């Protein structure tokens, strides 16, 4: 399961790249951003929070 | 001398119509209308403002212009002209507005949304 993988993406490496930038709060690796390091959905939750500015919304 | 002037707006194409008494002649961007705008043999329609206003004519022209393609960019010409003709004489507004060309077309492109792909086609349904 992901519980040891938590350490995997935190462990050291033989070399540069066998790594990934998963989410912090969630552990979903896929569908993430290098801007905030958050999965697809925590961003949604905390965009509704308006925690960060943030904007949101619907001007496009 | 004197010279009239106006602004032009459509289709992401902007023009600062500079309209002066003269022969009736164009060098857009210091370059003629004809070879510049492909192809194009449509410039009667660009002179139809003269076909209806102070007809025949003529007044020479200057204009700086950028943005979009020839369609809007040739079509961004007129409303600065016709507006400069309101500024010339509002009398012909009755001859303009009954014929358009001082009404800037408010229409433009749309946005995207889920459904669109490479060709602007929304999806099929489940046949079989």
């Amino acid at each position: 399961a992901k519980t040891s993988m938590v350490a995997k993406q935190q462990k050291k490496q033989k070399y540069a790249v066998r790594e990934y930038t998963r989410c912090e709060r969630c552990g979903r690796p896929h569908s993430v951003y290098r801007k905030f390091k958050l999965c697809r959905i925590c961003f949604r939750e905390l965009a509704y929070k308006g925690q960060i500015p943030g904007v949101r919304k619907a001007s496009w | 001398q004197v010279e009239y002037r106006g602004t032009g707006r459509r289709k992401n194409s902007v023009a600062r119509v500079r309209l002066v008494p003269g022969e009736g002649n164009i060098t857009v961007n210091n370059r003629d209308v004809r070879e510049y705008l492909p192809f194009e043999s449509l410039i009667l329609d660009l002179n139809q403002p003269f076909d209806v206003t102070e007809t025949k004519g003529n007044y020479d022209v200057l204009v700086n212009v950028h943005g979009g393609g020839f369609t809007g960019q040739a079509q961004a010409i007129r409303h600065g002209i016709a507006r400069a003709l309101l500024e010339a004489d509002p009398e012909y507004r009755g001859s303009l507005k009954r014929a358009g060309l001082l009404t800037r077309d408010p229409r433009m492109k749309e946005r995207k949304k889920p459904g669109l792909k490479a060709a602007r086609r929304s999806p099929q349904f489940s046949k079989r």
């Binding site: 697809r40 961003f43 949604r44 500015p53 496009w60 | -």
Partner: protein
């Protein structure tokens, strides 16, 4: 000889009224201030789906806003310096004092 600055916050009221704060404290002890020369104030985009497992086509969008303000002042002197670093608040602005 001039002074210049750059501002970046994500509310259009507070940032320009704050410009009036520092500008007021500036032409207090100076003058020759360029008014709030606007800037294009571009944006961003961030798209996320309303889902967890499936249903990709039905989604949602977000963005970011990014205001910039160009303000300057001429014939400098140490008084307008203190007007610069005197009153920037609220601190959502990102002042960059320069010359």
């Amino acid at each position: 000889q001039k002074i210049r600055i750059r501002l970046k916050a994500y509310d259009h009221r507070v940032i320009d009224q704050s410009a009036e704060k520092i500008v007021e404290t500036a032409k207090r002890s100076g003058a020759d201030v360029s008014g709030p020369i606007p800037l294009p104030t571009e944006k961003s985009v961030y798209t996320i789906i309303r889902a967890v497992h499936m249903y990709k086509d039905s989604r949602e969008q977000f963005e970011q806003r990014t205001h910039k303000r160009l303000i300057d002042i001429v014939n400098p002197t140490p008084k307008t310096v203190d007007a610069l670093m005197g009153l920037n608040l609220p601190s959502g602005v990102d002042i960059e004092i320069k010359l």
